[model samples]
Target chain A: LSVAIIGPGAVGTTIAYELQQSLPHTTLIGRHAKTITYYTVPHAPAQDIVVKGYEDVTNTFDVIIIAVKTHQLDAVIPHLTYLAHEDTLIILAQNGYLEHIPFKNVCQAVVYISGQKKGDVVTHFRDYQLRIQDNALTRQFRDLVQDSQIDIVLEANIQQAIWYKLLVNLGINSITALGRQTVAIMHNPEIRILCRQLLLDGCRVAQAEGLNFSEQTVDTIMTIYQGYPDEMGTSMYYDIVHQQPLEVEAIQGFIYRRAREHNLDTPYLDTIYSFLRAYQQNEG
Target chain B: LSVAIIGPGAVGTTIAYELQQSLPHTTLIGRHAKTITYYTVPHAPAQDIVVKGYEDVTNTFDVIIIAVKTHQLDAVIPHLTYLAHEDTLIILAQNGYGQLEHIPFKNVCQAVVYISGQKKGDVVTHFRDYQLRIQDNALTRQFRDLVQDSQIDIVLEANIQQAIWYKLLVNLGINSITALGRQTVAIMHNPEIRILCRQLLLDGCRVAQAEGLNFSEQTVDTIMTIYQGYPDEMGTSMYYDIVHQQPLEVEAIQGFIYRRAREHNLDTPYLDTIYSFLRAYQQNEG
Candidate 1:
């Protein structure tokens, strides 16, 4: 089966590199045709991969992976619709909760790929795992990538998986981005307490949305955050540092909106969402 | 009367410049004796003034103005006591609510300073008008008359304590947000940030009212309007301090509200959270 990866960013390029290893017909699509200086490791020798522009694409693939940032999903939807047929399997490999997809055979994948893109250079940090809901389309895509380096874990409850990732990002991303610090900030007792409060508020909203998160979910996520390299920062933190647009709407904004729908009081989430939105507006 | 102005910082140097114009004997004291390259206006020529070191002072002053930051006040208290006699009038030209009951001086007066400037090393840049609001009393009145001929406007406020609380509220809103957001006054233009700031001011006003100051709800709206008048590029004192990684006046501003909220048993979650984050930032030294 043919595979097409949209968004020649860090995630897209990494996915393309892994799939291309097994499938010769795999294609990487972007806004413009260019050579991506790909790095499998930091400061390592580069692998220059050629990407085709979306307008220049002439063939449709059996599987389509959209790996753009959540904020850039709106623009990619038209391109996605243009390339996808009625029987095409569309996989959303983005972060945050995207409520509605207009496609018939669409599956949301909780991507665990970690990397960053600087201009034409794309750095693949770690992980190539994508967790998708157990569905016919997801099964077909999983079989297609069986020989590739990508790890497609089929989950029974994809909604819960997505919510878990959202909660994790909600705590670390919001704190690190707002404080302009790295994971080392979690070492502070006060910061850890504040992070836990943020996650607990997020857990309440997630529970309201029918996602079953245990009471220890906040502590579990805190342990994961504390285990991160002290110098490592989040996607939101780097975005703020680089003056790029944040994934505020899809992460914090989504939780805040759902809490309002449930008529729940989440002061910590509300404050974090307000500041994140304000930072985005100031950048605008 | 002999006059000594401690703290050769922006405020201290500005005050020293004004006082020296009228009282030629006025001395600006710092940790070390050096020349202060002072600028009355930004990007303009500078006035080089020599400052005396506190250790080199031989004569006690008739009037001593301690113009250091509130956080630096504890270390300066001993030096203040050494230079001030029983008859000497001690003026505390600082920001925030600093309790003076622990001090040995009985003639001390707290001044709501309005002098704005930036000090880098030996250079000081004066940005705006030199003004001060102090409680009306014998010592303050005498100190006011001494500098009457200079550009400094010393207003003898009948309700100076209220003025201090009001200024604290203003700082509590803008300073906390700007320093945390790492932005300038332009951030207030964003409606979301403006709402957050308004909420902070409202919380601060509640604590102020509980402490015997009758601040109305409209004070929040009034302060928000005042914020709109500032230039987009303008930064608050706390914002600059954060940018430079210097010590913040969080204790005098957000910490003040946090303590008072606890005393009044008021639930000021926003103020409490901001104070905690600021304290953590200070602890982290970033």
Candidate 2:
């Protein structure tokens, strides 16, 4: 399988570094034009990933893996013409609620994966569970990675599923972010009850928007609370914890954005969103 | 030798009652006029004191006793013209600082003594010391009555030897006029420093007023504390305990009344005059 991994960030590098061992023709396209042999793992299995500058990618591949961040997506998107063929599959490996827009061939997946950026390497926190839209485009990538992936939840109803993922980050993650916890320790008895209640509350909100979750949906959302790795830090918590720029525009603000569009009243989400947005401004 | 006891209050009455068999014709000109047999000893060794009415005071006596209350003195004063003739000696046994204007013709004794009115007819809390002023007038009261009275101090100086007499009155929450030992029992001892502090605070208010020159607490001491001891609850331990039992005068209300009077730049005369004029007059008469 010929796959050209552009943007050698955490996702790009990981996929590039992984496929470099098995896939013969995996070329790395990053911002600066340079040729370097990137180490796959430090003090461990020596998997070497080679970065080829744009001028160096003289040959086109079967599929183009777009693993840049959402903000960096446009940069990586237009640059795809340099490497992507008309039929080459583009996988936006970045996270958040962004779906794939119109392209000759494109596939989007909600990256339920956490990664750490050490000096030169992106350390995978635990594992990656990608909620991929079930379409001919993603099925093609699934056939390609038949056995190598640990988590690949091919959600048929990927849109509602993404909303499910958004609800997960709404309060629990924002709570950790706003409270400035070391990590998402929502399972602490008091916080556990609070988080679960908010999850249940969020479900009711989504239902008002015609999402139509089951009566037990809140309980199921709470089950996700337990399913997380202990102290698993979500993006929102990760952002405001480190006082890094957040995607309030993506997670909470986006919910409010849609709510205002529908003229729907979402006091709970609005309050949480406004508070955290205020916190983000304060952080500046 | 004759000693006429005036003011038939507890102290005057008690002394007259006690002296009936021992002394001669002690006249009683009190707020009221009555002739009753004064029961001596209350319980035993009984004798009778027939109280002489005011108009019956005909025979000139050698010595006169003024035992009326300090405030009651003015009312009892003008009638004492009979006793005031010539050099007839006068004795003041009232409980206050002074009483010279009322008894200016006699020896003024600021008789500082510790005695109580414990029982009717009998003076229960009797002074262990039988004191008298040795200044000529008090001495003229036939000082040697077959015995010696030691605590008696004779002040015959050209000027009066001053003294302050004090007493608490009915307004003191504890020991209403009729109440006696129950006061200390209920207020002082019942709770540690509760009622006592309440009284002391009232006293302190007077002291503070004294410092300010506004002797408002005088009324509290006189009208409320001492003089108002009456009709059972209004009387003091002296008035309540002994119906009548005294030949000597005691001072009360001087501290509160005099201290209060200082605020108005007013001198308390009765409080001052007893030690001054009467004592000085006694020295001069001698």
Candidate 3:
């Protein structure tokens, strides 16, 4: 499928470059309408490529990937409607969970990958996992990327799958952001106590929203978090360290808001969300 | 009454200077043998004061003040016993609680003071109360007379343990949150943190209440009011330790509350969260 991925950040740009090797066409849209550099892997040779701004996305594409941060999603939403038709597949590649996709054909992709951008170069940590809903369109895209390095999984229940990814990110992103520590800090048995509580808190919020998760949710996330390199840090952690405006509302803030909707008491989620949101304003 | 103050830290030195003005002779017994500079108030003219070492404390004084950090109290215990006689009154001026006043003294007064000191520099800032409560006996009264002229006040109370526990309760939550956020009391202005703050304090209150302190809403109101008036940049000692990369005193502060809550089985989720985070943060230290 021809894809137009918006917000060519570390993840967006890397995935765009990978899809370009398989798909007929893939255009990266971002504020910078200049040539950029990226690596297939962290230590691989860097490759230079040109990208288009939103104003230059004149041609409609088969798949529209909203790969922007949560806060930037709203600003880019109205523009996305103009860039696609009724049958144009919409894949949200952002953090947090959003069930209401404004477009007709929609499937959210929980990206199980990480990347770091230093100047023009993007360094991917590992092979990318593009988890999408098991639909005819997703199956087609899955086939397209089958020969590529990206792992495309068509989930039978993408909603729950998205929750699984959301819960994992919620645990790591919020804690690391608040503690101002690298993701590796979560591996510390002492830090993991809170990490486990945070995971349980996220799962409780999910259960409040009618998602049944077992006690193994915490264990599942710790395994994934511990699998990463000792120096690995979350995107939210990077944003905080860089003093950038965080995606507070869409990450842990989403869980807090959900718990509030159910009138559930989520002290842990509430504390992290309040701190990160206040910190975001402090940076602003 | 002659007074010997062990460990001439800011609190020790400040009390020693105050005692020097009242007592005939006040010798600061510490590891250091240097003359120091101190100020009665912040930004005031500094005074050069000569403090004595432990060897100079040959004569047992009428009163002895243990004005050191809680951790430092352990090291000075044996020395304090040596410098204190059977008639000596020991006043502990430290953070957290553990009745360590079993040393050979007639009485040990636990001081619940509100004073801050700048590091390295000897400048001290005084606010309101330097409250110390002791048993009401003639010898204790005589020791109290030694510090009567000074700003530090000694009161006779039947509930010193409650006061010690009360002070510890206030420090745990406020210090942890302030240190964790690396912000001043202005952090409570944010609603959710304040909610979490209330949760922590309520848990502390429950623990305190279990220990027989109504600590009423009046106490809570007074604390919140005090926090509001504080300078936005002002920080707790815990916050200072964190910024300076010093070891955290989590065991004394939060650990006390957690143990109390466990004794009562009171679910203080916010305090546990803050405790775990600080504990996690503690492991990163050298």
Candidate 4:
């Protein structure tokens, strides 16, 4: 069976690199057809792989993975519909939640891939895991990738797992992006306090949506943030520095809007949402 | 009467320029002695005057205007004490409320300055009119008469402390955001930024009222309108300092409000958040 991974970004390229070993027909699609360098370890050897543009693809695929940013998903949907058939198992490996997806067979995966795309080079940092719901579509896709080095974990409560990841992004992403710093910013005592408050507010919103996360969950997430290297930069921080469009709508925007719907008082989240929105609006 | 203006910045140079017209002994003291070019208007003719360093001063002055930033006041105080007699009038032409309990002088007066200007190297540009409102007293009246012949308007106010607090509130709202966003007044044109600024001003207003200042119900609206009237390209003093990586006056502005809010047990989430971020920014600079 033929497989297609659209968007030659960090996530898409890494997944394609692993799958290309077992599935030779796995095509990495992007805006322009070119060869990209993938670095699994920093300052080590690299792999030169070919990527195709959308106009070059003429055949339909049995499995499609849309790994673009959430803000860029709308433009990708039209191209996605053209390559995806009714029986094609489509997987969305994105952060945050998309309220609606106009597809027949689709599954959202909680991607744990840590990497960044710089120019034509993709640097894979640590994890290469994807957590998806235990179902026929995901199980089929998992079986297809069983021979590869990619780890696809099946979870019965995928929605709760997604929410947990959302909370994780909420604290670290907002502070780093807004402050225009790296993970070292959390070293500030006040920034630590700010991040904890942000996580608590996010937890309240998640609980309102029927996800019961205990108070210890925030400390656990803080521990995860502390585990990251001081020099490590987040996705949103890179977006701000590179002057690219942010995934504000998918992250803070989602939480702020959901809180408003639930009549929950989240002053910290409200302040963060307004600043990020203002920052995005000023990006011309 | 001998007059001395320490800190040859924009404010100090402008005051010395005007006072030099009538009072030639109005020495502009700074780090090193140099001749500065002062422009009374943008793209206009300039004035070349000499500025004196602290070592050149051998005599005390009857009128002294300490026109330095609040943070730089500590370094200037010892030299200031050497240049002033017991009867000398010390006018503080600085921003924000700096509790002068540590200052040994008793004839000190805080002046509410409304001058708008900028300094680039040795050239100073006076963008707007120069006016100072000082508390009505014997020493200040002597100062008002010293520069009365010049074009400087010195209004004698009975309640100058209240005036200083009002200007502090205004600066707290605009300067904090402009420095944090690293933008000018143009960012205030955005609706989201405007809303956030209004909330910040509302918090400041509440703090002012709690401190026994009779602020109007429409104080926030009035301040918002005042900000809207400024030119789009204009930036606050804090904005300029932050852009150039100079030290900020966060302590005298945001820190003051945060402390006041904490003392009164008033909830100022927006101010507290901005203060924490600014504090982090200041610390991280080291």
Question: In DockQ terms, which candidate is top?
Answer: 3
Ranking by TM-score: 4, 3, 1, 2
TM-score of each: 0.89, 0.43, 0.89, 0.94
User: Evaluated with lDDT, which candidate comes out highest?
Assistant: 1
lDDT of 3 by residue, B1-286 (tens): 6777776667777777777777648878767577777777777687666777776656787777787776566678778656877867787777776545444555767777555665475444442345666546776677777577887677765766666766776786578778887777767777877777766776677777877777866666666656667777778888888878877877667877777777888877777777767776777784
User: How do the residues A1-284 of candidate 1 rate in per-residue lDDT, one tens digit apiece?
Assistant: 77899999999999998888898689999988999999987988889888999889987778898898888888887776678777888888988874456677888889999898988999998999999999887888889889998999999889999999999999999988887778787777767877898899999999999988866998899888867998999999999978889999989998999999999988778778878898888777
Model 4 residue B134 CA deviation (Å) reads 2.5
Compare the candidates by TM-score and give the number of the best one.
4
Query: What 10-residue stretch in candidate 2 chain B is worst by lDDT?
Result: B177-186
Q: Tell me which residue pairs clash in candidate 4.
A: none
* Candidate 3 chain B weakest ten by summed lDDT: B121-130
Docking quality (DockQ) for each candidate: 0.46, 0.00, 0.60, 0.59
How close is chain B to the truth by TM-score, in each candidate?
Answer: 0.97, 0.53, 0.88, 0.96
Please, what are the lDDT tens digits per residue for candidate 4 over residues A97-156? Answer: 743557677888899988888889999988889998899878888898999978999998
Between candidates 2 and 4, the one scoring higher on TM-score is 4
Candidate 2 ranges beyond 4 A from true positions: A33-43, A53-62, A98-102, A112-114, A147-153, A183-194, A208-212, A226-232, A276-284, B1-286
How good is chain A of candidate 4, measured by TM-score? Answer: 0.95
RMSD of each: 3.1, 35.0, 3.1, 2.1
- Cα error of candidate 2 at position B240, Å: 74
What is the model-wide C-alpha lDDT for candidate 2? 0.52
Stretches of candidate 1 off by over 4 Å are A34-50, A98-102, A116-126, B37-50, B99-104, B120-123, B145-151, B157-159, B262-266
Better of 1 and 4 by TM-score: 4
Candidate 1 lDDT, B211-262, residue by residue in tens: 8988988888888888889998999999999988999988877877788898
